[PDB]
Design a protein around this ligand. Structure first.
Ligand SMILES: Nc1ncnc2c1ncn2[C@@H]1O[C@H](COP(=O)(O)OP(=O)(O)O)[C@@H](O)[C@H]1O
Ligand SMILES: [Zn+2]
Ligand SMILES: [Zn+2]
Ligand SMILES: [Zn+2]
Ligand SMILES: [Zn+2]
Ligand SMILES: [Zn+2]
Ligand SMILES: [Zn+2]
Lengths: 187, 590, 596
């Protein structure tokens, strides 16, 4: 605070006080100087305290209000991301089998656990060992859930392609053994 | 949500309340605007009101920070500061408010009523962004006005296609045409549901109106048809792209030895190529849309899209392109409504084509290589930047003629508008001249070009064909309603009906009537090829019939008549009511 | 994350953000640099700008550190404190920083534009660490300037190796050279997938140029070729190896009396070993690389490395070694790089062969007993520091002529560089002397050797094999069809068209020329395999065709003429307008119709 009315009034009070001190006037003049100095101090108090008090509240209001603007921007970004994910996900399902089994239903509501059971287009099978591999997906094709599936590509744990001819009793203890078998729907 | 200012374009996030479009303003700019205008409402991350519920002061002149919110003096907390800054308004960003003073024009933009030509001419003189904002707010004003239109408190219905219309008292009962959109609302103490997109045109005879809706019931008594308004979207692209000069061709594929009428225009086509764009300023009838198809013949290789203002012009363009260019490389995009018919022979809205056509309001947001636009006079500056935003190509072509009639602009009821100030492009055309010009009206023979060049145009126009000796006139007045009910001259219709037999090849002469009621009643009586001027804009016919109803600022317009006569090919017969206007031309009277 | 002051070697944790290379600086050094230059951006362990939300106060002086974070003056906490004060800047090692006096030159290099010759001489004389920093930032500026050119797009597609270019109007078109590869970006529905790098070559015709691409993908209209970027790695090892001497021949085993054909340099071979490094100056076309092969044969057991700035030069050196040095020999120069076809002889990286020959662009960081560096004028201090970092031997040889073509320095638009200012090797050779001399241009005609001796030399060059058909056909320069920055002069070939079907014996010639694109126009109509003046300096030929361009400052270079005709062995013919040089070159000039 250096450009306030109290600043100027205290400055001229000090000018008068120092002028009369250098003049060396009566003690009553000294008392007048002391009174002027003291009223200049009090006038300078609020004009150098109130503005500082308002400064902090103005600054904190600025900070809170910037934070609110940032919040709104983040909200917009997440909304756009969510809706674009929904729309990009839905467009890889509409097999007519879905319409078929929805219409055949009595009102429309069908349990969730059957939708991937009937309208799915690809099957993934995870296998613990060779013995289980025997009595399940044996040969180039097999059946499960009342349909025909033909094997297409087989990978190991480390995501390396494994040839079907390598899967055998004697060759078994040479592979990572969560074997993943991916297959398609034979119509 | 933060942006730049407009006058100073500094980064800020303040908006005005009373300003209808609510634009971004900086601190100093907003302070100036609220000091000058009567706008006493500012928008920010929150509205500005006296937070005390016992007060409802929204004026920015006085508002006191009540800790975190705004207060009046009667509710101002002790330790609190008014938020009217030192000649600014307190808020988002103050340390980067660049100064700019051209606020007075901006204040006037948010002030005037758009009833005086000074408003419109001043609008087309400010900063680009200010021009866009003015066009946007004008469009919004028009939408608000047309919203406050008639509420047809009807009472009777004739048929499944025909009904009786009656209206309320106080609001403007709008005219009836296929252009407008209406819908009835079932007032049954509830269920005020839309009855469908209902269009309306006046019936054939008497107190009869023909009604057609998207759904069609047999309408009841208590309903009403209110005109709703469509929203206006903001835009960012410039109205006009900058010019750049080149040296060689800009990558276009020619066709050697294709035609002959356009090898002379090959120099003009290359002049277009050596720049980012080019325009066309010439009289109607003389290689306008025809300078177009040959130019396409010069470089018929790129995948392109075009359009036009109205439907007749684009349909004629489609026919011309079919005549010259191969059919299966061109398309015409149609709208969803399509209540007004179009080229009903071509591809039904095939956006996947090499040389595409469409209308102004149904343009897609794809791009092309070149493009041409029709009749800049009929268009505003808003749609120019609209197509600039949605479509961005490497070459642009614009056609137009200042002598043509401009867009309606119905709110301007005072004075005439100079042809240059029709849009920005017309001002540029009249100030810097054309890019290429053609002046020899080819469809009309020498007598018509002589009449138009002697009377309204400059004595420079010429033609290629001699007089066809099919000029005739008529002057007797007739009687009209004189009390609203736009003028209808029935005795002239009767005399035309009685006479026509003597004129053998005039049975299919294109009848002209700018007034909708006369336009309908003429076809109702006999069935001539009825037409209006507005819809004759950019058309052309062997046999035409023009009919002047009475005298008025509309019917006495020089531009209206001269654009009406530029559509004569081999034959025409037209009538007046005005003496000196009858004497002005240089044809045979009879 | 910490380091020693670049101007004090004082440990510190401060680097100037506004400077390019931002090395470590002591508090006093950083204070001086920030208070002198407008570089009000210092990168400490964290940036320094205000931590208040939305405040972008940048100047350190305006910044005050507060509650464990920096602040603007407005957001200052109740206990505030300025950063820049007391002649220092706050940070670690603050009290223990030493301070030196190198503020002015550091500011100059941090603010110079490298366009004027002052930067090179400054970098050629300044402190060793300052030399390294200047070389690093010089190459960085060179890379950034090249990275400001225009993007090449398509106008239409012709074939797998033909295509019309559609440059952006208003952008500097990069020269369609071999060393100009641009990655091909095609954009579809995004699918902003690169299609590989493509280099262009202006054929004998229009915009459709013949191009070589890394991949054989179809050239689509929706594809362009953006410039391929480059990076600069920091260099720490010094440029010049310090000069040492030894009383006895150390690290080298002398042979007795073998290879007497270079007995004029055997005493020189021993004295090179008794010093640490011994540069050698040899006039163009002199017994260069003959000293090298003699020294290599004199020390067969010692491991030796050849080094040349040019791929053509190192190819010439390796061919000379193949002809002379026994094959215990290889030239591990370039695996697949260097569009100019370098060796095709042996391994590129085995590090088991003895006489390993290489180039800076693929130097292996290994060690040998000795190493010889040739063509020491066409290189910069950056590459010298690079090669000194890569290899490290017991004795070093830097053979080169100051009177040759220096490094290109395409930004050297103001003035030029003296043969002493080309690099610090050139400086050391030209301050006190190359501490060696070998002048005998016997492989070139003695007549042209004498004329060169009368051109800019002091008649100290002697040779043999005089005259023959030496001439200079004085044909005026015609129309200059410079499609690229370099000037194409086909009317000069307009008289070479009468030097193609007329000469019964002048067929095995190597046409040298000043400009690269006027060599490209000879490559358009190939009367003989031609080479640019840059591929000269190290391999000579019997006949040399020579056609110049208009009287520009490039073709008129006397050193260019020297290095161009020193590749001739028996005869020479030059096509210049020849306004002044036709009188100093003592050849029997001819005309357009007089060739018999
Ligand atoms: N050079 C020309 N040769 C023959 N006919 C022309 C020529 N230029 C224009 N036309 C005729 O003009 C008609 C189209 O009108 P136009 O001259 O393009 O101006 P606008 O279409 O705006 O009135 C076409 O039917 C065409 O026959
Ligand atoms: Zn306002
Ligand atoms: Zn502003
Ligand atoms: Zn209140
Ligand atoms: Zn710096
Ligand atoms: Zn230091
Ligand atoms: Zn701050």
């Amino acid at each position: 605070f250096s450009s306030l009315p109290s600043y100027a009034a205290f400055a001229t009070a000090q000018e008068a006080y120092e002028q009369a001190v250098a003049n060396g006037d009566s003690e009553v003049v000294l008392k007048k100087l002391k009174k002027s100095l003291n009223v200049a101090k009090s006038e300078f108090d609020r004009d150098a305290a109130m503005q500082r008090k308002l400064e902090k509240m103005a600054d904190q209001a600025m900070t809170q209000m910037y934070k609110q603007a940032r919040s709104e921007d983040k909200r917009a970004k997440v909304t756009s991301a969510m809706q674009t994910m929904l729309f990009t996900m839905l467009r890889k399902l509409d097999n007519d089998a879905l319409n078929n089994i929805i219409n055949n239903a009595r009102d429309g509501c069908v349990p969730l656990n059957i939708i991937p059971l009937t309208t799915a287009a690809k099957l993934m099978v995870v296998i613990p060992d060779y013995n289980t591999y025997k009595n399940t997906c044996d040969g180039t094709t097999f059946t499960y859930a009342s349909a025909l599936w033909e094997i297409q590509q087989v990978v190991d744990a480390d995501s390396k392609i494994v040839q079907l001819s390598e899967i055998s009793m004697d060759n078994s203890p040479n592979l990572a053994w969560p074997l993943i078998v991916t297959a398609l729907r034979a119509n | 949500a933060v942006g730049a200012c407009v006058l100073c374009n500094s980064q800020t996030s303040l908006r005005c309340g009373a300003c209808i479009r609510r634009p971004f303003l900086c601190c100093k700019c907003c302070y100036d605007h609220v000091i000058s205008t009567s706008h006493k409402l500012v928008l920010s991350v929150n509205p500005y009101v006296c937070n005390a519920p016992g007060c409802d002061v929204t004026d920015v002149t006085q508002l006191y920070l009540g800790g975190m919110s705004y207060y009046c003096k009667s509710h101002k907390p002790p330790i609190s500061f008014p938020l009217c800054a030192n000649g600014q308004v307190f808020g988002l960003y103050k340390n980067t408010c660049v100064g700019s003073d051209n606020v007075t024009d901006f204040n006037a933009i948010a002030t005037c009523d758009w009833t005086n030509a000074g408003d419109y001419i001043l609008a087309n003189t400010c900063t680009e962004r200010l021009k866009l904002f003015a066009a946007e707010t004008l469009k919004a004003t028009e939408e608000t006005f047309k919203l406050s239109y008639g509420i047809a408190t009807v009472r009777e219905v004739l048929s499944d296609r025909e009904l009786h219309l009656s209206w309320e008292v106080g609001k403007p009962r709008p005219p009836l045409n296929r252009n407008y959109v209406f819908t009835g609302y079932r007032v049954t103490k509830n269920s005020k549901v839309q009855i469908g997109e209902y269009t309306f045109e006046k019936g054939d005879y008497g107190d009869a109106v023909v009604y057609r809706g998207t759904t069609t019931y047999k309408l009841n008594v208590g309903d009403y048809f209110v005109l709703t308004s469509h929203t206006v979207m903001p835009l960012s692209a410039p109205t006009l792209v900058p010019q750049e000069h080149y040296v060689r061709i800009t990558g276009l594929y020619p066709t050697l030895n294709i035609s002959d009428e356009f090898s002379s225009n090959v120099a003009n086509y290359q002049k277009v190529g050596m720049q980012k764009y080019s325009t066309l300023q010439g009289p109607p009838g003389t290689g306008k849309s025809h300078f177009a198809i040959g130019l396409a013949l010069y470089y018929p290789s790129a995948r392109i899209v075009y359009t036009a203002c109205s439907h007749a012009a684009v349909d004629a363009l489609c026919e011309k392109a079919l005549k010259y260019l191969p059919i299966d490389k061109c398309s015409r995009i149609i709208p969803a409504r399509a209540r007004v018919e179009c080229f009903d022979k071509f591809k039904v809205n095939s956006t996947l084509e090499q040389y595409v056509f469409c209308t102004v309001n149904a343009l897609p947001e794809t791009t092309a290589d070149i493009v041409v636009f029709d009749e800049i006079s009929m268009a505003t500056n808003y749609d120019l930047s609209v197509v600039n935003a949605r479509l961005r190509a490497k070459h642009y072509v614009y056609i137009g003629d200042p002598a043509q009639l401009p867009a309606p602009r119905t709110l301007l009821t005072k004075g005439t508008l100079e042809p240059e100030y029709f849009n920005s492009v017309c001002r540029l055309m009249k100030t810097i001249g054309p890019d290429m010009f053609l002046g020899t009206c080819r469809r009309c023979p020498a007598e018509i070009v002589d009449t138009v060049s002697a009377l309204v145009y400059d004595n420079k126009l010429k033609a290629h064909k001699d007089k066809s000796a099919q000029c005739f006139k008529m002057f007797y007045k007739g009687v009209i309603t004189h009390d609203v009910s736009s003028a209808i001259n029935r005795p002239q219709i009767g005399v035309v009906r009685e006479f026509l037999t003597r004129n053998p090849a005039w049975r299919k002469a294109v009848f002209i009537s700018p007034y909708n009621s006369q336009n309908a009643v003429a076809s109702k009586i006999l069935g001539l090829p009825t037409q209006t001027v507005d819809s004759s804009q950019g058309s052309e016919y062997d046999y035409v019939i023009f009919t002047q109803t009475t005298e008025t600022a509309h019917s006495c317009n020089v531009n209206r008549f001269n654009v009406a006569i530029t559509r004569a090919k081999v034959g025409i017969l037209c009538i007046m009511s005005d003496r000196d206007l009858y004497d002005k031309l240089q044809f045979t009277s009879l």
